[PDB]
RNA sequence: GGUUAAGCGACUAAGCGUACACGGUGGAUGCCCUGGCAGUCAGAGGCGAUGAAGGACGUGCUAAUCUGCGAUAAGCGUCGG
RNA sequence: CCCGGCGAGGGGAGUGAAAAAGAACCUGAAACCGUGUACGUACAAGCAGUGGGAGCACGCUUAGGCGUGUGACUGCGUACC
RNA sequence: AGGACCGAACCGACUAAUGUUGAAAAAUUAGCGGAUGACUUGUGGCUGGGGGUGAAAGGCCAAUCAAACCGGGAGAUAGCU
RNA sequence: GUAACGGGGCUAAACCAUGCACCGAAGCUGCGGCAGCGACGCUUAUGCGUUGUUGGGUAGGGGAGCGUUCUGUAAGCCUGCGAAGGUGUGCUGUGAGGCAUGCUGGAGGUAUCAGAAGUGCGAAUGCUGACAUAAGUAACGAUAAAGCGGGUGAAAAGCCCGCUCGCCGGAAGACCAAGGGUUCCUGUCCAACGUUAAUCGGGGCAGGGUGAGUCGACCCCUAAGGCGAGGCCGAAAGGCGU
């Protein structure tokens, strides 16, 4: 059972969301839920929404009994970057990379 | 007639990368840097194809010296005795015999001593 | 080095800090409860509690000083009228701080500071 | 005030190794409401040490 | 079998390196083009004060662009296909 | 239909030869970023490779090595135009 | 009356500090000189490149001036890298 | 920083004479494999029962070859029981390369011999697009300053209202002139922007809003100056001017 769930084009950066993902990597659904709820990060809620989507998918589109479910594979990946021009001193122009990341959560009973 | 060289360039780059596969860092990822490794690797292989003979000769000489000194004779004296006895055996087989069968090496040493004296 | 010194700065000058403490104490004693960051409540205890300590007693000069502090006629009227007798039997610890998590805007330690009252 | 050569991903990962957070691992269950909350913090509903503290 | 001593000695990976499988940014290679470049065969080489080229503003049931048109305004009349 | 914030996106259902053909849409590689697997690494110094090289993890006929990954240690070894 | 005196707006930048991938491609704080006259300013024009203007420094002529910018000779030439 | 045997260290492991042994190179020898040069016994557009020798190489000169686009071969052949590209593997040739296949792909490719190159990239402080590095670091753009309460909202320090604290007030207030062109108001949303969030905005969509005989422009006259019927001058252009 895969029961995959992802949130593409997320505003949060992959480098900053991998830190939150590692905390819940390989932990039980309830433990991950509470850790994300009480984590002091925007990425915490960003990935808690994905975890809720995944568990709802498991409940409805797949087998019930979410109690014996574990987050087996979770990984954060970068997404398309938007180019923005920010004026600087001496007339110099630099480019600001509005980075977006793809987050995928896979939950399986075994 | 415009000719696109992308396929040929990619083929050559893949050949170089597969030759350089297994290296550390960018040496196995960047073609521009991996190309230096394969040339240096080839030079090292060319040097080692000659260095291996002399290194194995060194190791065999060390083993024969050890065995001869254990038996009670020096390597130079043992070789001189073999030459005087007209024995064409080489260091590789001598070292194999010394490592595996002690009685054979004892026979070699005693015959060499008899020839010398 | 700050060896044994007391008094937070709160990234504010003396005038701004004293005005902030005055306003916060006035609001706290007016509403019997407020929400503020934990350091703010910790530093506001040392300001609010002496207000109640002073209000314990009643006199013309005491009223004038209680007005000079907190600069609010309505607040001083509430003091000496309801804040006095309701704590005449309590010696210290007139305020209670309950941590309530972190603010969403900037993730600052939030805590509710209130009097030990409201048992209606 | 500038790098002579580009550092490698190995050194980058070694530096970032210490940037990982640590889970609270201190979820406390209320005696009365039986709700999870941060230690020495009031619950979301407003219950702390069994008795209510927020009245809202 | 136990007490003591000496010697030897794996099992750890916060992270990192190699090879494999799976992912992502990325538009390179492959194929197609009503799109361009150069010629041959022929016409013509001008448009215009009975108001030229090029434009502004309007023109549909439709808020906007393209295209055609001008208050007769995505158009009107005669004769043919 | 469900999660989600009457969003975005995703998961189910259906269309479709194909949906890792879903409009950020033909074929979809590289630099770059992660996950899991096997190995090595926290007393060991330098173009990070080559020759030797024990051990470990995967399949084979035979029961010994052979095919691949890793590779402690060791002699040599100061990138390219 | 003063090409007067001290001193606001206004004009300019003499000193110090910060700012040199700055708030700014010469800026900000305090001091600083003029502030009724050779003062300044709003508007509208005139003087166009070996030429204009210049209380004259080789200064300014649209952030570029010991000869501006734009297009052409022009893919000037380079015994040089 | 010992630093004038390489170090350890050596009273012979220091120096002179002699001898016998060994290590010691890609040097020679033994074997196998490849290519050029001259000969003779023979094959005669080529093998050699052969023989001797050569094979380090920059600039440079000579010869022989591999790869791709297209054209004739070619309306022939492979190809939807799978072409080209992509991606790993096993063989094969002194080599540029060649062959077959695991998976993606989806409809083009092309044997042998010839003909032409826009025919082979690793650099030129090279050009175009993307991604790392520094680095999750500086910074988040005058040191006039926010707090509490209620409301909406999923989320409130910044969105709406009330009380406090602070700043300009010859302005940090109100009108205009020049300059912008709907940014002005309402409803509606957080796709993108605000150097963070935002329910908010000078952001996205829709709608509404600009009323002049007395305001200004328009219009009469005109200064500096422009154009200029005729006219003067100048190769033309054109310059002056009534």
From Swiss-Prot, chain A:
<keyword id="KW-0694">RNA-binding</keyword>
<dbReference type="GO" id="GO:0015934">
    <property type="term" value="C:large ribosomal subunit"/>
</dbReference>
<comment type="function">
    <text>This protein binds specifically to 23S rRNA; its binding is stimulated by other ribosomal proteins, e.g. uL4, bL17, and bL20. It is important during the early stages of 50S assembly. It makes multiple contacts with different domains of the 23S rRNA in the assembled 50S subunit and ribosome.</text>
</comment>
<dbReference type="GO" id="GO:0002181">
    <property type="term" value="P:cytoplasmic translation"/>
</dbReference>
<dbReference type="GO" id="GO:0005737">
    <property type="term" value="C:cytoplasm"/>
</dbReference>
<dbReference type="GO" id="GO:0003735">
    <property type="term" value="F:structural constituent of ribosome"/>
</dbReference>
<feature type="binding site">
    <location>
        <position position="90"/>
    </location>
    <ligand>
        <name>L-tryptophan</name>
    </ligand>
</feature>
<comment type="similarity">
    <text>Belongs to the universal ribosomal protein uL22 family.</text>
</comment>
<comment type="function">
    <text>The globular domain of the protein is one of the proteins that surrounds the polypeptide exit tunnel on the outside of the subunit, while an extended beta-hairpin is found that penetrates into the center of the 70S ribosome where it lines the wall of the exit tunnel. Removal of most of this hairpin (residues 85-95) does not prevent its incorporation into 70S ribosomes. Two of the hairpin residues (Gly-91 and Ala-93) seem to be involved in translation elongation arrest of the SecM protein, as their replacement by larger amino acids alleviates the arrest.</text>
</comment>
<dbReference type="GO" id="GO:0006412">
    <property type="term" value="P:translation"/>
</dbReference>
<dbReference type="GO" id="GO:0022625">
    <property type="term" value="C:cytosolic large ribosomal subunit"/>
</dbReference>
<dbReference type="GO" id="GO:1902626">
    <property type="term" value="P:assembly of large subunit precursor of preribosome"/>
</dbReference>
UniProtKB/Swiss-Prot annotation, chain B:
<dbReference type="InterPro" id="IPR005813">
    <property type="entry name" value="Ribosomal_bL20"/>
</dbReference>
<dbReference type="GO" id="GO:0022625">
    <property type="term" value="C:cytosolic large ribosomal subunit"/>
</dbReference>
<dbReference type="GO" id="GO:0070180">
    <property type="term" value="F:large ribosomal subunit rRNA binding"/>
</dbReference>
<keyword id="KW-0689">Ribosomal protein</keyword>
<dbReference type="InterPro" id="IPR035566">
    <property type="entry name" value="Ribosomal_protein_bL20_C"/>
</dbReference>
<dbReference type="Pfam" id="PF00453">
    <property type="entry name" value="Ribosomal_L20"/>
</dbReference>
<comment type="subunit">
    <text>Part of the 50S ribosomal subunit. Contacts L21.</text>
</comment>
<keyword id="KW-0699">rRNA-binding</keyword>
<dbReference type="GO" id="GO:0005737">
    <property type="term" value="C:cytoplasm"/>
</dbReference>
<dbReference type="GO" id="GO:0003729">
    <property type="term" value="F:mRNA binding"/>
</dbReference>
<dbReference type="GO" id="GO:0000900">
    <property type="term" value="F:mRNA regulatory element binding translation repressor activity"/>
</dbReference>
<comment type="similarity">
    <text>Belongs to the bacterial ribosomal protein bL20 family.</text>
</comment>
From Swiss-Prot, chain C:
<dbReference type="GO" id="GO:0002181">
    <property type="term" value="P:cytoplasmic translation"/>
</dbReference>
<protein>
    <recommendedName>
        <fullName>Large ribosomal subunit protein bL17</fullName>
    </recommendedName>
</protein>
<comment type="subunit">
    <text>Part of the 50S ribosomal subunit. Contacts protein L32.</text>
</comment>
<comment type="function">
    <text>Requires L15 for assembly into the 50S subunit.</text>
</comment>
<dbReference type="InterPro" id="IPR000456">
    <property type="entry name" value="Ribosomal_bL17"/>
</dbReference>
<dbReference type="InterPro" id="IPR036373">
    <property type="entry name" value="Ribosomal_bL17_sf"/>
</dbReference>
<dbReference type="GO" id="GO:0005737">
    <property type="term" value="C:cytoplasm"/>
</dbReference>
<dbReference type="Pfam" id="PF01196">
    <property type="entry name" value="Ribosomal_L17"/>
</dbReference>
<dbReference type="InterPro" id="IPR047859">
    <property type="entry name" value="Ribosomal_bL17_CS"/>
</dbReference>
<dbReference type="GO" id="GO:0005829">
    <property type="term" value="C:cytosol"/>
</dbReference>
<keyword id="KW-0689">Ribosomal protein</keyword>
<dbReference type="GO" id="GO:0003735">
    <property type="term" value="F:structural constituent of ribosome"/>
</dbReference>
Curated annotation (Swiss-Prot), chain D:
<dbReference type="GO" id="GO:0000302">
    <property type="term" value="P:response to reactive oxygen species"/>
</dbReference>
<protein>
    <recommendedName>
        <fullName>Large ribosomal subunit protein bL32</fullName>
    </recommendedName>
</protein>
<dbReference type="GO" id="GO:0003735">
    <property type="term" value="F:structural constituent of ribosome"/>
</dbReference>
<dbReference type="GO" id="GO:0022625">
    <property type="term" value="C:cytosolic large ribosomal subunit"/>
</dbReference>
<dbReference type="GO" id="GO:0009314">
    <property type="term" value="P:response to radiation"/>
</dbReference>
<feature type="region of interest" description="Disordered">
    <location>
        <begin position="1"/>
        <end position="37"/>
    </location>
</feature>
<dbReference type="GO" id="GO:0005829">
    <property type="term" value="C:cytosol"/>
</dbReference>
<keyword id="KW-0687">Ribonucleoprotein</keyword>
<dbReference type="Pfam" id="PF01783">
    <property type="entry name" value="Ribosomal_L32p"/>
</dbReference>
<dbReference type="GO" id="GO:0000027">
    <property type="term" value="P:ribosomal large subunit assembly"/>
</dbReference>
<dbReference type="InterPro" id="IPR002677">
    <property type="entry name" value="Ribosomal_bL32"/>
</dbReference>
<comment type="similarity">
    <text>Belongs to the bacterial ribosomal protein bL32 family.</text>
</comment>
């Amino acid at each position: 059972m895969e029961t995959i769930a992802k949130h593409r084009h997320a505003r949060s950066s992959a480098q900053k969301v991998r830190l939150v993902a590692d905390l819940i990597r390989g932990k039980k659904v309830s433990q991950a839920l509470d850790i994300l709820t009480y984590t002091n990060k925007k990425a915490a809620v960003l990935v808690k929404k994905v975890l809720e989507s995944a568990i709802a998918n498991a409940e409805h589109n797949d087998g019930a009994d979410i109690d014996d479910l574990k987050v087996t594979k979770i990984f954060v990946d970068e997404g398309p970057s938007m180019k923005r021009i920010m004026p600087r001193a001496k007339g110099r122009a630099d480019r600001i990379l509005k980075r977006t990341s793809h987050i995928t959560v896979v939950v399986s009973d075994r | 007639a415009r000719v696109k060289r992308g396929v040929i360039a990619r083929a050559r780059h893949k050949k170089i990368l597969k030759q350089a596969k297994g290296y550390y860092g960018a040496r196995s990822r960047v073609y521009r840097v991996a190309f230096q490794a394969v040339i240096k690797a080839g030079q090292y292989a060319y040097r080692d194809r000659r260095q291996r003979k002399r290194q194995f000769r060194q190791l065999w000489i060390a083993r024969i010296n050890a065995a001869a000194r254990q038996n009670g004779i020096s390597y130079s004296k043992f070789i001189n005795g073999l030459k005087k006895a007209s024995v064409e055996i080489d260091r590789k087989i001598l070292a194999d015999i010394a490592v595996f069968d002690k009685v054979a090496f004892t026979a070699l040493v005693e015959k060499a001593k008899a020839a010398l004296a | 080095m700050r060896h044994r010194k007391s008094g937070r700065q709160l990234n504010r000058n003396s005038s701004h800090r004293q005005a902030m403490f005055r306003n916060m104490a006035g609001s706290l004693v007016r509403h019997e409860i407020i929400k503020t960051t934990l350091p703010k409540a910790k530093e506001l205890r040392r300001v609010v509690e002496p207000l109640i300590t002073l209000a314990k007693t009643d006199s013309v000069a005491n009223r004038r000083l209680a007005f000079a502090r907190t600069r609010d006629n309505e607040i001083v009227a509430k003091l000496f009228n309801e804040l006095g007798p309701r704590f005449a039997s309590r010696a210290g610890g007139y305020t209670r701080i309950l941590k309530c998590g972190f603010r969403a805007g900037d993730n600052a330690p939030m805590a509710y500071i209130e009097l030990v009252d409201r048992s209606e | 005030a500038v790098q002579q050569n580009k550092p490698t991903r190995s050194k980058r990962g070694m530096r970032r190794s210490h940037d990982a957070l640590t889970a609270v691992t201190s979820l406390s269950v209320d005696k009365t409401s039986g709700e999870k909350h941060l230690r020495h913090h009031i619950t979301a509903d407003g219950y702390y040490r069994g008795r209510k503290v927020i009245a809202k």
